[PDB]
């Protein structure tokens, strides 16, 4: 029933203020971070106990060397982009790559870049093409599309390797990644009722009020509690002149709290 995902994020900053990394890379399975690297440590490090226990030192030593390479490539690509835009000072380059494994077996994959936090280049692995936001991106896309070997490499990586990595990491983090922690839900009282849920995992939760759904409802965001679980809320105001109830849905289970 659960869709799982593996995602890598890459951040490059030119002229970073003293101490701040020029380059950072973090991987995630779902919301759980699994790996980190930056230009300050210059070391690939696990970010889950189940990654440290199942991947030997030689894995981290190899991945360190790969990330030293990706850090240099980022610096060079960002410096070229700044030239193409006659930009100086600090500018941002971002890369995001990932796949999803669905319950049924179907997969998705994605790869995109941003310059200064705006879409730059988006890969379509089905048409083996790149969408480019502007002439500078278009010029780069056209060189990438002239290299059929690299496109086919990326499609195979997204569809086969990323998914094999995800399946390997799901097995390693089985007990953490596949668990359900059902929410604790309470109601508290300006004469408003707050429906408050916490201790839940995974983060996906639906919360509402009824009496007939209430239309004018404030929603708290799903926020991380820090201990691997999440919290959220839905509030309503009471017309002083009517029997109200909180409805929560989580991982296939429905909960109702009737308020007297």
């Amino acid at each position: 029933m659960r869709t799982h995902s593996l995602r890598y994020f890459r951040l490059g900053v030119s002229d970073p203020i003293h101490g701040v990394p020029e380059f950072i890379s973090v991987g995630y399975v779902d919301s759980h971070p699994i790996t980190t690297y930056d230009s300050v440590t210059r070391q690939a490090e696990p970010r889950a106990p189940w990654m440290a226990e199942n991947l030997a030192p030689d894995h981290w030593e190899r991945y360190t060397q790969l990330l030293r390479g990706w850090q240099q490539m980022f610096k060079v690509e960002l410096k070229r982009l700044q030239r193409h835009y006659n930009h100086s000072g600090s500018h941002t380059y971002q890369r995001m790559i990932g796949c999803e494994l669905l319950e049924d077996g179907s997969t998705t994959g994605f790869l995109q870049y941003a310059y200064d936090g705006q879409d730059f280049l988006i890969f379509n692995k089905d048409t083996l093409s790149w969408l480019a936001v502007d002439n500078v991106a278009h010029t780069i896309k056209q060189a990438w599309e002239a290299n059929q070997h690299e496109l086919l490499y990326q499609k195979n990586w997204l569809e086969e390797e990323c998914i094999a990595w995800l399946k390997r990491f799901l097995e390693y983090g089985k007990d953490t990644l596949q668990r359900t922690e059902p929410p604790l839900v309470r109601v508290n009282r300006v004469t408003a009722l707050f429906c408050k849920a916490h201790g839940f995992y995974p983060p996906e939760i639906y919360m509402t009020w009824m009496k007939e759904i209430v239309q004018e409802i404030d929603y708290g965001d799903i926020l991380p509690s820090g201990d691997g679980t999440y919290q959220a809320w839905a509030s309503i105001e009471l017309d002083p002149q009517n029997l109200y109830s909180c409805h929560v849905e989580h991982s296939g289970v429905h909960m109702v709290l009737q308020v007297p």
Partner: antibody
Amino acid sequence: GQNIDQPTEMTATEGAIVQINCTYQTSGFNGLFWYQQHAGEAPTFLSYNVLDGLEEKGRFSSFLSRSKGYSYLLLKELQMKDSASYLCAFLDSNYQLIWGAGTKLIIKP
Amino acid sequence: AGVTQTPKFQVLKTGQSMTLQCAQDMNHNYMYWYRQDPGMGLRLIYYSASEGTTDKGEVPNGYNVSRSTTEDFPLRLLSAAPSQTSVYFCASSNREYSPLHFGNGTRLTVTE
């Protein structure tokens, strides 16, 4: 990244065709390469396959079967200058380049 | 103009030190040293994923390298031994998955 095999030596007639086979075994794959090495010279890149199918370029073709773990290099209208070693190699999941022992192609006039 | 590797031939006495030079002006991030021995296939001695870093291959013992620049990846035999009699190939690649460009090789003999 476990194993790779290709014949030691092959012999074909000038003007004909030859197919050099390469088998590989690996849990993890990022593409298979063919390189040509003339005696007393450096290896030179010929081809890259990562999906199933057949790539063609002049007299040369490269085929890959992911399920069988199997590539071939096909050389058509063989010339004396095609006498060389042909090296297959494949990238594993960590980008280890694994080299076959090479196949020497002798072209008989 | 590709990968430049010098020298093309070298005789050394057991115990001598030697530096093989390798340069590429293609801005490739990856540089490699391999030795080639009859039957043995291509064995990786050392590689560099970028300037500022290096790492061992299959057979690093008796050898050293440095990567001060994108362009250059020197290979050092600190104490020439007869077992290092071989053909050495420097190579570069744009990325970890892209094709290798090879230098024209160093044929090295170590005699007593």
